[PDB]
């Protein structure tokens, strides 16, 4: 599962 | 797609509550895809991100404004609003509504600011 | 966490802007970069450190080396005079704008 940060932030 | 309108500029006293609304028209304010977003920019300055709410509690704020702001929905209006306490000058800034959208499955996200208002005035003068 | 950016980049047209952002977790998490023109909402020009939305003219470029990443705009337009923020997110969660970069055309 991702979250706003993981879609948004995390490479 | 949303349409987000914040509440109408003006001032605000030091050491007194900051308060705005930002109503939103197309879709529910409960919905849990949406994170309700508050930025804010002091003239001549740059922008600041102070954090987004979402209608479950979910809360990510601005850590230098943690204890001093609240984001919170009214259901009934279809808003959501800002809070800050204790304003000084320092406050005095235009403060932009935004939201971000997150999917249910999406894996590729572009905007982190998909829908915006156009800002708000708000002048800590006494 | 801070990410840091030149104050001004002032340039004439034609010649190339570079505008850079620097942060220590940008390794770590993608940057994204934004144009402000009239105290405007921003518009996002550059995702990803290098990826370019729909309707952005293809002059707007972005790369990554670690710790810097950087905005180019080749062919600088007189439109193209506008702040410049770049945005991220520290390791907390925190999103962070840079400082801003104001783009001068002058000339």
């Known amino acids: 599962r991702s979250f706003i940060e993981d879609l948004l932030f995390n490479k | 797609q949303v349409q987000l309108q914040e509440s109408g500029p003006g001032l605000v006293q030091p050491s007194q509550t900051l308060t705005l609304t930002c109503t939103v028209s197309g879709d529910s304010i409960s919905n849990e895809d949406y994170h309700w977003t508050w930025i804010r920019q002091h003239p001549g300055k740059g922008l600041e991100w102070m954090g987004y709410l979402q209608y479950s509690g979910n809360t990510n704020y601005n850590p230098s404004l943690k204890s001093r702001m609240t984001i919170s929905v009214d259901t009934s209006k279809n808003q959501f609003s800002l809070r800050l306490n204790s304003v000084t000058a320092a406050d005095t800034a235009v403060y932009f509504c935004?939201?971000?959208?997150?999917?249910?499955?999406?894996?590729?996200?572009?905007?982190?600011?998909?829908?915006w208002g156009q800002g708000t005035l708000v002048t800590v003068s006494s | 966490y801070e990410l840091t950016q030149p104050p001004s980049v002032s340039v004439s047209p034609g010649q190339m802007a570079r505008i850079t952002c620097s942060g220590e977790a940008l390794p770590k998490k993608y940057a994204y970069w934004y144009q402000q023109k009239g105290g405007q909402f921003p518009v996002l020009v550059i995702y990803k450190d290098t990826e370019r939305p729909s309707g952005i003219p293809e002059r707007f470029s972005g790369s990554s080396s670690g710790t810097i990443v950087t905005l180019t705009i080749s062919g600088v337009q007189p439109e193209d005079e506008a702040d410049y923020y770049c945005l991220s997110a520290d390791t907390s969660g925190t999103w962070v704008f840079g400082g801003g970069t104001k783009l001068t055309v002058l000339g």
């Open positions: 935004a939201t971000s959208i997150v999917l249910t499955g999406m894996s590729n996200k572009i905007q982190p600011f998909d829908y």
